[PDB]
Design a protein around this ligand. Structure first.
Ligand SMILES: [Ca+2]
Ligand SMILES: [Ca+2]
Ligand SMILES: [Ca+2]
Ligand SMILES: [Ca+2]
Lengths: 96, 96
């Protein structure tokens, strides 16, 4: 098996699972971003599912300032999450 | 247990599976990158497993010019792969 190839497949399909619900089918608007985070990455925002948190996230992800998250911005986001997971790979911050 | 979260875990674990083999345990050298690409992402390089292909790949990934690929650089690489896969999601080039 090639788990990494299957992982990349899931990263692509999961974006479209939500991005195609409304409007531009290649970008996540606020509504679609909320659904994606809540259903697919619940560990990221955890308890922070209020509007202030979602607007902060949209602002952080939306690098080109078009009010939506496109595939490239979404991969930067996932890469950020992966970098944070990577810090705890040993079950403690091996760094110090 | 959410599939996207599992995908991120695979991204993380697969880097360490190879980066820890030689030298700096947190970066991929040429030999480690070859094994990773070959065993885990064989569809990427396809038939281009020659020395010239690997040198070009290493210089493309190693954006800080330290001769190895760190986890951040590896996430940029995986993101590039996903972006390329994503271009074909509709079954035709949906672009301009
Ligand atoms: Ca949309
Ligand atoms: Ca945007
Ligand atoms: Ca190494
Ligand atoms: Ca480097």
């Amino acid at each position: 098996a090639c788990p990494l190839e299957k992982a990349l497949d899931v990263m692509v399909s999961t974006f479209h699972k939500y991005s195609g619900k409304e409007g531009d089918k290649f970008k996540l608007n606020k509504s679609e971003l909320k659904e994606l985070l809540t259903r697919e990455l619940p560990s990221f925002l955890g308890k922070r599912t209020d509007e202030a948190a979602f607007q902060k996230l949209m602002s952080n992800l939306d690098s080109n300032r078009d009010n939506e998250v496109d595939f490239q911005e979404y991969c930067v986001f996932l890469s950020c999450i992966a970098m944070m997971c990577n810090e705890f790979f040993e079950g403690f911050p091996d760094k110090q």
